[PDB]
Subunit: 331 residues, 4 copies
């Protein structure tokens, strides 16, 4: 039962990027998650003038990726099956520009080599975060460059940081929408490593493992948050008749087919912690990335069961890491 | 905390259809759900010799449909965007034959007219139910004909009936798998009607709204059911290194795009009640069907919120009907 | 000389059904037998004269990785599996998917009714709507699919009016101009590399040869010639708006699931050379790309003929020619 | 007479980048201007001589329903929205998606930085890899996309080496045989029905005319002629295995999302007539089908030319011819 963070009513007429001398800020959030995942780096930058920002996951070696662009209102660039970086940003479709800044920065680091096998590949996805503030500032090329420059191994800024600066949840009615943030979680099991990163800007609300609504759809008249379905069902009885962007990164080798099905499974699992989810109103996009370092055993047995060690098993574990990250974003 | 229904170990060498004089049985289940949904009929038939069966949803006028074949191991026939019937069956891919029986029975009722606009369209999906018994009997053409002949408005046989005869859940290890069944639920809100039908044969387990595991992955050594992720995570720590078929039927007019996104949303929502879900091991297939009788208002407001009456709202309500149906199947 | 017409005639869209007849499957021989060498692949074609309608079955008992490209707007598909023991192509619109159920249960019987996972027999089926081309409602049923599998043999394919091609037809701007096609196959061996194409063209469009000549479909009995449909369509718009093909490509070259899927799309799109228009709303065009995984491509793609000359795309280009040859055999 | 060669020359795969130059956008004029009448649609083409590389922007300020058919195996796409205010086609591989960001922010500025939903400016962008055809790493950047939008005018299209077509090339079995193409457009009006095709062919394959002659790409300087790639591929397999095109079709005819999506697939597949091979692993082929929703098809599809003659498939067949004309203009 956290204190409310109501976003408040829309403001119109606000200034855009051209109005300011915009200075990127290295986002620190409310606290830093630290973890051990060699070969992965994360950077987060924001403009205070939005407030809005971008979060970049950089895997300099490049990593095989599956994309599950499941929502009805997706803002995606690249969506490549192999990436050197994933860029998550505010600013609606304008914020895809941040990924261009990452791309060209990587081209510069590569000394402008352009062989087809050396192209630097950045996939980007965005949230609409303009209802949560009163400017039109968006993550631009310079901000994406800055988020990459700020990237370091083994750290993630929780909360209002990067793409999470103006993320919000619970959009039955804007008077009940609350600011979320971005979140991350990490587990290591044996040699296996799983990192989840999420920027929940859902139409739905964030739900914990007990089924409590913990962020979004807060009614100041009652002091209580509501699951949206209670609102929806009563709206129907009255009147008829009268986005989350996310990444899961692991080091377990998966074939393209396993990796794709892993992405679908983990993404669907997020309907536990975000409700409703995968709606027409949402642009929900999950990237499943593997650094392809650790083999699963050829056969799937253990003391825990004959079918206990396989990609589905990994997907179930990763689903829990992701739920933890969603709850960090809503905290 | 229901009593266990352990399916027990595989049996091999069992007899197939050719060995028996197979008599269809009208399935009655453990109890009958009654509801008011003109233009929809449901029939369920089984062979005791399996035990295995088929469940047919017949909409004689035909209805617009979206299919969300999300699992990794799908057994689907037709998958049409307009259907006169949906056939759900056991018998793995062999059980798609039941839908052929429905199709030809409908052709006969149409006096063998064959104009392109008069083709009778049946979409079928199947579960693998051979690990839950010791015969190779499957739902054949005759059984699909029988399920159609047995179809009546406004009734559904809950539990071990039709396609649910030998459905089972919780497949980390076969020694912990439990028999489920089929389930249905129905709500009417104003003029809006929503019927959910489900045959859960998941690799995962059935979970209630409190987060309790209520069917599947039962350990006779402990007397307790386990969420699979506890098994999976310990299997990884040890060793590295050392299907649900469903339909939602409503009467609300939705465009092809709304109906498709509605299908995705409702299907993903089932990861609340079935965990894990949408895995590589599963052939999860949802049909979203509308009889296109009731308009939504042109604008989405109500006293409950500015964005409270739309297809996403309907999807959230339908998601709850579906969860109720899953819990009926597991009861 | 322009080919003689094979007009289908005016459709009635109905007639007696299967049980009005004592239906005996006939092993289809077509007009000619293609013979080829590709062990592990058998083809069977059966028909009912009383339709006339039929089914063609490709049986690969080892099982083979498959990509499905269901590109048309009116597809009739069952299974569509990424690994198949058989592919069943049939007439009878969606009713003819039943033929594949006959193949499936016959294969289960051969496996002594074993039902373990590695033992499930996987049959993907696709259909053409062939009811415009005859005055009956007979369709390929379980018995006909069983018969087509029983008749399957390696190294033979009956060209023309045979199996699923028995009542296939082309050129559907107006039914008065529609012509019977057939089924067709072609085969090439390049060293030990093997490519087999099988096609059952029932297009809304017409069959076109490598010169751009319309050779089957859209025959106007008032002119004695076949025009490209676009001439009819453009004239129709001036007046009124004033100011399925099912196919398989089978190869022995190893391709990963990703390469195989893209190969399927490439070969399928290539068929818009020989069938025009293609991939329309009005078509249920479905191509199965199957590999028996017997021989590897070299690790690098060079040859004397270029730096990017030996790869799955190259194989796709070669297979596209085999498929155009098969289309032309169907229309011959 | 066979067309003269335009060999691209041997690629070095790198060179100076954008900020090595003081880059001024140039309004591209190409070899010739196509003129046509289609109010509500503007086209702008800009290039950097220092690449050479460029971008071509189609601006539809009302916004228009769109279907995207990203059929190739190596696609570079941003947005891919089902409703667009602009389509941006560019060189520079994935770096050139940045040009579309320039278009997007220019449109936001025109809207006075309003950010409501109905006001979000939607730009879909696609790219070709044109770095093989020049010795620099200059790409279409935000400034070049802004310039292409500023230069956009109704009723004009610069054919040839212009905009995104500036360094487009064809026929990539071996880089020694690759030839510069260009961009191309064609237009037809049938009563008030309007169809505009725009294409930037950078294929692995070659451009083929209606006779089946290879007209651009795969020019062998040792023979003085262009062969179909399949001749090279089949010879390569004998030896070594011993025993992108981005495009738009814009029409004013109303089509539902379902019809429009199938129309996109149909027209895109039709391009395997003029580009061969096509839809390969090696290609990022992406077609945008856009309707401005100005005129209805009749409710029933009949005419004097047939019972099924006036429908979205018919429109697709006509549009496929407009697109082949555009491909040939690009290769001319």
């Amino acid at each position: 039962d956290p204190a409310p963070r109501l976003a408040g009513p829309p403001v119109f007429g606000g200034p855009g990027n051209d109005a300011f001398d915009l200075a990127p800020v290295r986002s620190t959030g409310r606290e830093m998650l630290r973890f051990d995942f060699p070969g992965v780096s994360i950077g987060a930058a924001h403009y205070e003038e939005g407030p809005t920002g971008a979060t970049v996951i950089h895997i300099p070696a490049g990593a095989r990726t599956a994309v599950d662009a499941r929502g009805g209102a997706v803002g995606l660039s690249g969506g490549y099956d192999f990436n050197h970086a994933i860029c998550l940003a505010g600013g609606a479709g304008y914020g895809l520009e941040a990924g261009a800044g990452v791309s060209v920065a990587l081209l510069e680091r590569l000394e402008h080599r352009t062989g087809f096998a050396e192209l630097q590949l950045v996939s980007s996805a965005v949230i609409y975060d303009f209802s949560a503030r009163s400017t039109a500032v968006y993550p631009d090329k310079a901000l994406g460059r800055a988020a990459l420059e700020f990237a370091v191994p083994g750290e993630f800024p929780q909360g209002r940081a990067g793409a999470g600066m103006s993320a919000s949840a619970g959009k039955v009615d804007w008077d009940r929408t609350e600011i979320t943030g971005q979140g991350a979680a990490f587990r290591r099991l044996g040699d296996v490593r799983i990192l989840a990163v999420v920027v929940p800007n859902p139409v739905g609300v964030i739900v914990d493992r007990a089924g409590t609504v913990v962020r979004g759809n807060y009614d100041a008249q009652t002091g209580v948050r509501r699951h949206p379905v209670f609102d929806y069902q009563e709206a129907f009885a009255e009147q008829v008749p009268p986005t989350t962007i996310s990444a899961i990164v692991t080091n377990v080798r998966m074939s393209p087919v396993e990796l794709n099905q892993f992405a679908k499974q983990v993404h669907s699992s997020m309907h536990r912690g975000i409700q409703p989810f995968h709606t027409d109103m949402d642009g929900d996009t999950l990237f499943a990335v593997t650094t392809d370092e650790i083999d699963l055993p050829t056969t799937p047995g253990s003391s825990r069961g004959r079918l206990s060690v396989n990609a589905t098993a990994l997907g179930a574990i990763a689903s829990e890491v992701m739920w933890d990250a969603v709850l960090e974003a809503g905290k």
